[PDB]
Amino acid sequence: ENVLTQSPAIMSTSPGEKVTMTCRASSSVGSSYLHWYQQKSGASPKLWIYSTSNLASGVPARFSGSGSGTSYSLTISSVEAEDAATYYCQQFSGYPLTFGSGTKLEMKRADAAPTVSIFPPSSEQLTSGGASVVCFLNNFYPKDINVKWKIDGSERQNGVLNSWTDQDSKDSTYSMSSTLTLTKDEYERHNSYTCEATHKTSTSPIVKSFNRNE
Amino acid sequence: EVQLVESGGGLVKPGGSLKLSCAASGFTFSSYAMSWVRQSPEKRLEWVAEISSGGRYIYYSDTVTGRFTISRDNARNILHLEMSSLRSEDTAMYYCARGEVRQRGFDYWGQGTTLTVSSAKTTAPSVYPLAPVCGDTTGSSVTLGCLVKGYFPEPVTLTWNSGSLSSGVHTFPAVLQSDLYTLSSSVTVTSSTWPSQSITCNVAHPASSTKVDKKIEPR
Amino acid sequence: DERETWSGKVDFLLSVIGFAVDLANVWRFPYLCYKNGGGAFLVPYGIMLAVGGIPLFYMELALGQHNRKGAITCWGRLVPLFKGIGYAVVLIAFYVGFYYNVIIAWSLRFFFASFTNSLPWTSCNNIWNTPNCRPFEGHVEGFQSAASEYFNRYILELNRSEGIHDLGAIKWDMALCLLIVYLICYFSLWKGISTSGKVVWFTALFPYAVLLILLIRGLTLPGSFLGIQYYLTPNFSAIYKAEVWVDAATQVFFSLGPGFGVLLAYASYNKYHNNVYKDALLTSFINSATSFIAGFVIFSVLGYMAHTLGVRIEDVATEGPGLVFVVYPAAIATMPASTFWALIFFMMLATLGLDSSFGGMEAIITALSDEFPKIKRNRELFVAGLFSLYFVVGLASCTQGGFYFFHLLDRYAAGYSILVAVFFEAIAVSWIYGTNRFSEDIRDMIGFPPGRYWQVCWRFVAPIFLLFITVYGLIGYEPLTYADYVYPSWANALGWCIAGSSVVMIPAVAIFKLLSTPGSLRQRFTILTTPWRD
Ligand SMILES: CC(C)CCC[C@@H](C)[C@H]1CC[C@H]2[C@@H]3CC=C4C[C@@H](O)CC[C@]4(C)[C@H]3CC[C@]12C
Ligand SMILES: CC(C)CCC[C@@H](C)[C@H]1CC[C@H]2[C@@H]3CC=C4C[C@@H](O)CC[C@]4(C)[C@H]3CC[C@]12C
Ligand SMILES: [Cl-]
Ligand code: NA
Ligand code: NA
């Protein structure tokens, strides 16, 4: 099986850059059987370039295809913001048909800090088996960020669920929701509850904590 | 005017069996070779099967061969894919892609239908409202959330105030942990709009017919 | 599976290119341009190529590569009701071998009859001449040339034959030449493709070496432009006529030899996923291009004759063996460095016929090598019998009246048979096999389906293009004659048997198998239109 390996996986670019993504191959491929597909978020793919260099209808001429043999590439002359998508290479040389690892195009924007806001467990859940603390780290850039949960200055490590959002369409930012979950018997013993968020922007971590009684 | 539309698709237990179908209009279906391409929830495009313009040559993926069976009938303009001996890793969104000319790739793609292979049991969410703590209640806007914990399978529909406001909302994707999803959302609105107003969380689990609403009690 | 392939894809192309480039490219195409309006003739020749010949040429070798089997097995394994097609195709190919190889033998005789400092077909003071001789051609009947008499009275010894019955002695020099023909046929076709695909490098390319030499020589002659003026001056009024389209359509067919079982046989050794479409387009272009070039080679010399020898060109712009064995050899005797051009011209005529002959005889072996597994097991000792069979009967084509026997089979043995044979090949595919069934076969290998053009050509144009010929062919049928010799009533009859002996096997299997398979009628018609893979 001939595997295609795309690079980079994530490409951070602002509108106006010249960007080029590659698609290396395990085995040589005919110059007429290599294709590219663009897949926007929440949508089905679309044939972007066929036979290495020939672009489909509607595809703006700012797109171009090149390469041959075992190394191909996709190039945008000048990126537009609407080009934020995931680009896949695919081969028809021999079966089984294989697609590429995909390059996700993400837009660049100025750094931002998380507007952190902590939440205690809910009274309703406070009747089930246990209780969970939900921290929010919204509207910030870039995507990577590190949470720290503490209960009495002590780093609680297990029992956390983290989920990031995809890049927002209007302000090109991200957001994250960390959800520490304990039982009641574990909850109703300690008071302080520290969601300490460390991000590239700040020197010292943004902290949002709360005492259980107030 | 060409259209592909997939169908079937749903939850199946490992070893189970299911048949997906694709309806084609806008072109003469009896003259274009069709292919099933699935993409995993990790967004990995993976080809499954190709069927000829008359179904006389058929190529299968090494990972579905024997378990999967592609088929078409052109009077009805339908393309089928029956699955059997279903393993968990067959979970994906299954695309029905028209690709007659090898040198030109797959022209048109359907919207795709989702299939899940899991032994996990269908459970309804526990919906909780997130009222901020009573301290430092001063900011220009205040934000508040809604935790949808412990449901299966996907999806779930979350809106705030029946879908009225949508500015400054952040509904997070679900995350599976030991055969259970957990989803959260946040809504940030001016402190001059709460807790003096009706702000609510709307959760909808079709798989369990669970429609639950919840307002945020600032207490 | 496990069927040997071409050692190199060139071995294939040179094998098919050599097959379709015969003496018709030299002795019939340029005459036809002359006869039918000069450059204007190219339009119906170019039309009938694009709508008729090329789509048929494209077909036969697309079937070869796909079904990977020889002619009979191939035709049996996709429409069994018409499996009789495959047989007739090989029967026609079988008969052709008896007379076509003589033209090679003749050129060979002329070849090592030219090893001297003064060629013999120039004078008329020789033992075999006639008081009615002339130095060159003429528009008179019973006053032939100096080479028209060397050909008849010495080489062929034909004047000693009173007809088809009287055959006289056996010209043993000729028999050795025909022996040399089949002998280099054997030592080039016994070990399989591994040598045939190699030998064609000489036979397909040597003509182009020679063609270039005489192209350079001819244009550098007094009055050379005059011949090109006779070759290409347009008279579009010919297009408004009807016989021109018949002359054009006919040449396209036989200058390409589609459906003869040879392209099927040659292509049945291609790898499955080979761009046959690029092959058929390239090879068939080279064919028509060679005819065009050859036409300049011929008429450059033809014009030199009307300007430095005083001959009405209508007495030298001729077709067939009269052009390449009498007219052209008479002119190169005049120009200096004669013995060179003669020796290279005749070997060109030899290499033009040999690679063309190989494909016919290879189509026979490959046909039944796939159908009769006893054959493929020991093939070297099969063809030695087939060619000795070709040789023994070929001694008739070496007798005093041997030409009379050649001329019969040229007009009958494959003249109409292969016309209606291919006509059933086209209907057996466009309607019984089906364009839809056939398109995805091609899509499987070359990656894309044949465009709507090749479909409409395969479905509507090509069949009427064939009837366009066969209709006119029959109305133009007269009892066979040559010069002042009218073949007897039975001579015509035997030829129709030779021609019918192939076509008769088309229904003779459509009825044999129709009664040898069980079931209802509609069940039998449905069980007999189902291919092999299914
Ligand atoms: C002006 C005239 C006389 C010159 C003739 C040119 C000759 C030499 C040209 C014309 C057709 C050409 C051949 C056509 C077919 C092929 C197959 C290709 O894959 C390799 C080159 C090869 C083998 C060519 C070799 C050279 C060739 C034979
Ligand atoms: C001087 C001689 C060589 C002239 C050559 C005539 C032939 C080879 C040329 C003239 C007209 C040309 C054709 C015009 C139309 C088409 C239809 C297209 O879908 C395939 C190519 C095809 C089939 C061309 C093939 C080459 C062609 C047939
Ligand atoms: Cl020709
Ligand atoms: Na020819
Ligand atoms: Na030749």
Q: Give one DSSP letter per residue of C471-523, joined into a string.
A: HHHHHT----EETTEEPPHHHHHHHHHHHHHHHTTTHHHHTHHHHHS-S-HHH
Residues 6 or more apart in contact with residue C93 via CB below 8 angstroms:
C260, C261, C262, C360, C361, C363, C364, C367
Instruction: Kindly compute the dihedral angle of the four CA atoms of residues C498, C503, C509, C514, in this order, to the nearest 10 degrees.
Output: -140
* Residue A211, CA atoms < 13 Å, CB-side half-sphere: 4
Task: Tell me how far apart the alpha carbons of residues C276 and C444 are, in angstroms, rounded to a whole number.
Answer: 12
Helix (H) or strand (E) holding C302: helix C276-308
**Which tokens belong to C197?**
């695909």
Resolution in A: 3.3
Q: CB B43 to CB A102 under 8 A? A: yes
How far away, in angstroms, is C313 Cα from ligand 5 center?
A: 27
Q: Do C502 and C421 contact (CB within 8 A), yes or no? A: yes
Backbone angles phi, psi at C104, to 5 degrees: -65, -45
Burial class for C298, CB neighbours closer than 10 Å (0-12, 13-18, 19+): buried
In angstroms, the Cα distances linking B30 to A16, B22, B162, C534 are 44, 13, 45, 19
Q: Which atom of ligand 2 is nearest to the CA of C45?
A: 6
Ligand nearest to the CA of C291: 3
Separation between Cα atoms, residue C171 and residue C176, nearest integer Å: 9
Q: Which CATH number fits domain A115-211: 2.60.40.10, 2.40.110.10, 3.40.50.300, 1.10.3720.10?
A: 2.60.40.10
C367 touches C90 (CB < 8 A): yes
The total of other beta-carbon atoms located within 10 Å of residue C103's CB is 26
- List residues near ligand 1 (CB under 6 A): C 10, 13, 205, 208, 211-212, 215, 286, 293
C451/A contact by beta carbon, under 8 A: no
Structure tokens, B12 = 């199946």
User: Which residue lies with its CA nearest to atom 22 of ligand 2?
Assistant: C50
Minimum Cα–Cα distance from B104: chain C residue? C448
Top-tier CATH class for B3-117: mainly beta
| Contact (Cβ atoms closer than 8 angstroms) between residue A11 and residue A21 | yes
Could you tell me the two tokens for A33? 């059987």
Q: How far is B175 from chain A (nearest CA, A)?
A: 7
User: Which ligand 1 atom minimizes the distance to the CA of C205?
Assistant: 28
Residues from chain B contacting residue C455 (CB–CB below 8 Å): none
> Rounded distance, CA C398 to CA C497, Å?
23
Cβ pair B132, A117 in contact under 8 A: yes
Residue of C nearest to B52 (CA): C440
Q: Which residues of C touch A92 (CB under 8 A)?
A: 447
Query: Residue ranges per domain, chain B?
Result: 3-117, 126-215
**Intra-chain end-to-end CA distance of chain C, in Å:** 17
| Token representation of residue C409 | 């089979």
CA-nearest residue for atom 14, ligand 1, is C286
CATH homologous superfamily for B126-215? Immunoglobulins (2.60.40.10)
* H/E run at residue C444: helix C435-446
Angle subtended at Cα B167 by Cα B161 and Cα B169, rounded to the nearest 5 degrees: 70
- Domain boundaries, given as residue ranges, for chain C: 1-534
Rounded distance between C-alpha atoms, residue C330 and residue C151, angstroms: 11
Asked if residue A21 lies in contact with residue A44, where contact means CB atoms within 8 angstroms, the answer is no
Measured between alpha carbons, how far is A52 from A91 in angstroms, rounded to an integer? 10
Q: Give me the residue label for tokens 């005492």.
A: A211
Cβ atoms of residues C297 and C332 within 8 Å: no
* Option in B30, B56, B103 nearest C448 (CB): B103
**Residue A30's closest chain C neighbor by CA?**
C447
3-state helix, strand, coil in chain B (%, to 5): 10, 50, 45
Rounded Cα distance between C218 and C222, Å, is 9
CATH of A4-107, one of 3.30.700.30, 3.40.50.2300, 2.60.40.10, 3.40.50.720: 2.60.40.10
Instruction: Enumerate the residues of chain C whose CB falls inside 8 A of the CB of residue A93.
Output: none
**Residue of the nearest CA to atom 21 in ligand 1?**
C10
Which of C57, C7, C12, C47 lies closest to C277 in space, CA to CA?
A: C57
| Contact predicate C246/C52, CB 8 Å | no
| CA atoms of C178 and C106, how far apart (whole Å) | 8
**CB of C525 less than 8 A from some CB of B:** no
Yes or no, beta carbons of B103 and C437 under 8 Å apart: no
For A99, the 3-state DSSP assignment is: strand
Answer whether B207's CB lies under 8 Å from B122's CB. yes
Token readout for A201 is 């922007």
Cβ distance C53 to C284 under 8 Å?
yes
Neighbours of ion ligand 5 (CB under 5 A): C 18, 21, 352, 355
Is the CB of B112 inside 8 Å of chain A's CB atoms?
yes
Kindly list the residues from chain B whose CB atom is less than 8 angstroms away from the CB atom of residue C533.
56
**Which of C386, C252, C214, C227 is CA-nearest to residue C307?**
C227
Residue A92's closest chain C neighbor by CA? C447
Tell me: cis bond preceding A8? Omega within 30 of 0 counts.
Answer: yes
Cβ contact C116:C445 at 8 Å = no
User: What residues flank ligand 2, with Cβ below 6 Å?
Assistant: C 46, 49-50, 54, 285, 288-289, 292, 453
| Residue to test with chain B: of C272, C436, C452, most B Cβ within 10 A | C436
- In A15-62, DSSP assigns E strands to 19-25, 34-39, 46-50, 54-55
Q: How do beta strands B11-12 and B113-117 pair?
A: parallel
The rounded distance, in Å, linking the Cα atoms of B93 and B112 is 6
Whether the link from the prior residue into C479 is cis, omega within 30° of 0, is: no
Method: X-ray
Which chain A residue has its CA at the smallest distance from B61's CA?
A: A96
Distance from CA of C281 to the nearest CA of A (A): 19
Q: Which residue is listed with tokens 């062929």? A: C156
Q: Which residues of C touch B54 (CB under 8 A)?
A: 436-437, 440
Nearest to C328 by CA among C337, C318, C336: C318
Q: Which residues of C355-386 are buried (b: 16+ CB within 10 A; e: fewer)?
A: bbbbbbbbbbbbbbbbbeeebbeebeebbeeb
Closest residue to B105, CB basis, from A35, A117, A165: A35
Domain span(s) for CATH 2.60.40.10 in chain A: 4-107, 115-211
The token duo for C455 is 């479909």
Contact A45 B109 (CB under 8 A): yes
